[PDB]
Amino acid sequence: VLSEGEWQLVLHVWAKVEADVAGHGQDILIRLFKSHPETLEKFDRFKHLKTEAEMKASEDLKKHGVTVLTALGAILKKKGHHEAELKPLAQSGATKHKIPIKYLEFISEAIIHVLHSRHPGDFGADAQGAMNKALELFRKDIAAKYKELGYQG
Numbered sequence: 001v002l003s004e005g006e007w008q009l010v011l012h013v014w015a016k017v018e019a020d021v022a023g024h025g026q027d028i029l030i031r032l033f034k035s036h037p038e039t040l041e042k043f044d045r046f047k048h049l050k051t052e053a054e055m056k057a058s059e060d061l062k063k064h065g066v067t068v069l070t071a072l073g074a075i076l077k078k079k080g081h082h083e084a085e086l087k088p089l090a091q092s093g094a095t096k097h098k099i100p101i102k103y104l105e106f107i108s109e110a111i112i113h114v115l116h117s118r119h120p121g122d123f124g125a126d127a128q129g130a131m132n133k134a135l136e137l138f139r140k141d142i143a144a145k146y147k148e149l150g151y152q153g
């Protein structure tokens with residue numbers, strides 16, 4: 001679905017993310033919870049954290065951000081050939097945490113927001129478009145996996 005040129009733009013900006021996975025993960029999750037407070041209720045250990053400073057000081061939250069971005073990054077690098085990497089994620093969001101595609105859209109929005117805020121020069125129109133297509137592919141394929149497992153989220 002994505003051309004070679006589009007994948008290169010995606011992997012180019014992702015390399016920037018890998019310069020500080022922890023920091024990007026924190027900003028993305030914090031942005032997620034603020035723009036969509038309902039998503040926070042999915043994390044039990046994450047609500048005695050009332051302020052942005054507390055969320056950033058939380059090593060638990062930081063660890064989770066890296067776990068999330070690391071998994072997404074591995075998938076993006078497969079350039080569409082991610083069935084093997086996607087299967088495990090589908091099981092988690094469909095059998096263990098019940099994460100609807102709508103929430104994946106929310107977090108995709110947070111990802112785009114943080115990428116543009118931290119890397120303007122390397123995340124212009126063409127790059128934003130590519131990332132959007134990559135994340136849409138990801139959400140489409142995981143939704144199909146969700147259904148195979150019996151989850152219509």
Ligand code: HEM
Binds near residue numbers: 067092096097099103
């Ligand atoms: C970019 C998409 C995402 C990726 C790649 C991802 C990846 C992961 C991975 C690798 C884990 C650890 C294994 C597991 O428990 O299944 C995890 C856990 C979890 N994720 Fe997902 N995730 C994503 C999006 C989301 C969203 C949007 C939510 C909710 C609003 C969410 C909520 C959770 C929760 C609650 C856990 C359990 C954590 C714990 O107690 O440490 N994730 N995720």
